Structures are given as structure tokens and as C-alpha cells.
Amino acid sequence: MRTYTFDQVEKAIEQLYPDFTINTIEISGEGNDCIAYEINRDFIFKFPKHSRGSTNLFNEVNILKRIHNKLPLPIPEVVFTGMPSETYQMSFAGYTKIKGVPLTPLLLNNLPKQSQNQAAKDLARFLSELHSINISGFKSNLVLDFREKINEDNKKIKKLLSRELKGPQMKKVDDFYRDILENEIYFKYYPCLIHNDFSSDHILFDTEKNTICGIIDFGDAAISDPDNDFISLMEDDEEYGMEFVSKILNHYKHKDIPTVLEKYRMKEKYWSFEKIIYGKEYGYMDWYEEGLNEIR
Ligand SMILES: Nc1nc2c(ncn2[C@@H]2O[C@H](CO)[C@@H](O)[C@H]2O)c(=O)[nH]1
Ligand SMILES: [Cl-]
Numbered sequence: 001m002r003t004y005t006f007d008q009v010e011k012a013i014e015q016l017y018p019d020f021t022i023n024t025i026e027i028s029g030e031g032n033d034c035i036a037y038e039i040n041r042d043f044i045f046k047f048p049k050h051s052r053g054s055t056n057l058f059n060e061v062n063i064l065k066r067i068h069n070k071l072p073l074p075i076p077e078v079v080f081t082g083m084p085s086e087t088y089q090m091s092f093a094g095y096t097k098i099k100g101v102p103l104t105p106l107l108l109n110n111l112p113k114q115s116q117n118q119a120a121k122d123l124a125r126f127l128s129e130l131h132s133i134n135i136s137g138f139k140s141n142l143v144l145d146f147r148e149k150i151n152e153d154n155k156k157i158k159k160l161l162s163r164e165l166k167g168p169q170m171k172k173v174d175d176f177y178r179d180i181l182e183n184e185i186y187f188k189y190y191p192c193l194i195h196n197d198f199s200s201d202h203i204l205f206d207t208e209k210n211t212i213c214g215i216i217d218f219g220d221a222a223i224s225d226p227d228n229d230f231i232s233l234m235e236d237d238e239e240y241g242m243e244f245v246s247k248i249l250n251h252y253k254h255k256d257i258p259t260v261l262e263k264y265r266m267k268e269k270y271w272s273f274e275k276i277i278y279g280k281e282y283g284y285m286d287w288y289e290e291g292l293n294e295i296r
Pocket of ligand 1 (some may be wrong): 028029034035036044076096097098099100101139201202204216217274
């Protein structure tokens with residue numbers, strides 16, 4: 001976590017875009033990587049909160065450039081870019097603002113049923129088109145192999161928690177990982193481009209038309225398991241629930257729905273472990289203690 005004032009934001013952008021006069025600045029929203037500023041009412045400028053976030057911002061800028069006209073929904077179009085330094089791979093990025101509000105579970109459920117169903121179809125067509133984008137020209141570094149990630153997570157957890165857990169407790173963590181890794185269904189998928197953070201906060205809605213009008217926040221985008229993009233929608237608390245996602249799956253012509261459900265169940269048990277690792281790697285200490293407490 002690092003912080004910006006309006007004066008730094010304006011100065012940073014002026015250095016590189018001297019001819020863009022700034023009138024108004026205000027915070028649009030915040031994710032885990034960047035703060036997003038609304039400039040001149042019509043632009044969103046993301047500035048990274050730390051080096052990791054900046055690397056994700058850099059990722060987002062390059063992916064958006066590659067897929068800019070391949071999708072059936074608006075996505076952010078980059079119009080302004082910052083520069084690298086010893087600290088940030090990209091100091092900021094500016095794009096055209098997508099008007100609209102997040103499609104919260106609450107909003108979605110209050111829509112007429114025909115609109116709920118168009119939303120499901122629209123989300124599926126967007127995912128289908130996305131997961132079909134040809135990935136040849138993509139940076140091979142973008143590939144996230146789930147088997148590799150799980151193995152590396154198991155060594156990170158050991159190394160992080162070795163002096164925190166009693167032996168029997170670490171042995172059970174070890175068992176959990178071993179069990180995950182002997183199940184081939186988590187690891188057999190055809191890699192493609194995925195949004196990888198495809199949740200309701202990132203789906204923008206036009207409440208005059210009652211239709212989805214944008215997908216945002218491509219900072220986690222990767223070449224990986226397409227099923228990631230359904231499981232992130234399935235949580236009942238903060239997301240859409242099984243019923244709605246099962247309409248999406250059906251429009252998508254998903255062939256193996258029980259496999260999607262099993263990946264969701266495993267991801268849900270996996271969350272404590274993600275909180276420890278994501279906690280340390282994004283320096284969110286609250287998450288770390290929560291997952292550690294849970295593990296006991
Ligand atoms: N309404 C709107 N919000 C955005 C846009 N880009 C970023 N944000 C907000 O800022 C947060 C961090 O990117 C997002 O998750 C949204 O809350 C945009 O184009 N339109
Ligand atoms: Cl249909």
C-alpha cells in the first residue's frame with residue numbers, strides 16, 4: 001500500500017500528456033492493485049498501490065491492447081500510459097470511462113426475468129468469445145498452469161507456516177495438498193485466455209436498457225482454465241449463485257457441468273490457503289491471520 005494525492009496524479013499525467021488539461025479529479029473505485037481516479041468525469045486513471053499491482057496494471061494494458069476488438073461487450077480502451085521505473089512496470093494507465101453500475105446480485109435479482117435471462121446469455125457469449133480468442137501471439141509468461149501453481153502453493157505454505165503450525169497440523173495441510181494433486185480433474189483443461197477475476201463487481205450494467213454494458217478489471221487475465229470464469233460467479237454470498245450460473249453454462253454449451261461444480265467446491269475449501277499466500281504476497285496481514293486461524 002502506497003498513496004496518492006491529486007497533485008501527484010495531475011503532475012504525473014502532465015509530465016507525459018502536457019496538452020491534456022485536467023479539470024476535475026475524484027476517486028472512481030479501488031481494487032487490490034490500483035486506485036482508480038475519475039478525471040474530467042470521462043476518464044479513469046489507475047495508479048498502482050505497490051510494485052505487484054503495477055505489474056498487474058502492465059499485464060492489463062497489454063492484454064486490453066490485444067483483445068480490444070474481439071469481444072461482444074465493451075471493455076476498457078487504453079488511451080493514456082505511464083512509464084516504467086525501478087519500482088513500477090507501469091506508473092499509471094488511463095482509459096475511457098464505461099458508464100454504468102456493477103451488476104450486483106441484488107440488482108440482478110430485482111430485474112424482470114426476461115432481463116435476468118438476457119444477462120446470463122450476454123455473459124456466456126462474452127466468455128465463449130473470450131475463451132475462443134486465439135492465444136498464439138500471447139506472451140507465454142501469461143500461461144498459468146494450475147498444477148504448477150498448487151505445487152508451488154504447497155511449498156510456500158510450508159515455508160510460511162513451518163514455525164506457526166504444530167507438526168500434526170502441518171501434516172494435515174500436507175495431506176490436503178496431496179489429495180488435491182492426485183485428482184486429475186483440477187489439472188486437465190485446455191488452456192485459453194480467461195478474465196480470471198470474473199465476478200459481479202467487474203460487470204457493468206446499464207439500468208435504462210437493463211443490459212450489461214461493460215466488463216472491466218483485466219489485471220488478473222491469464223491463459224489458464226476457462227472454468228475459472230464460472231466458479232468466480234458461483235458464490236451465494238457475494239456473487240450470483242448456482243441457478244444463475246447454470247443458465248450461463250447452458251448458453252455457453254458447457255459439456256461437463258459436474259466438473260465445474262467440483263472445482264468450485266475445491267476452490268471454496270482452498271480459500272483459507274489463498275488468504276495466507278495472497279495475504280503475504282499482497283501484504284494484507286488481516287487476511288493472513290484469518291486464514292491461519294481457520295487452518296486451526
Ligand atoms: N463505472 C466505472 N467504474 C470503473 C471503471 N473502471 C474502473 N472502475 C471502478 O474502479 C474499480 C477499480 O478498477 C473498478 O472495480 C470499478 O469500481 C469504469 O470504466 N466505469
Ligand atoms: Cl437461447
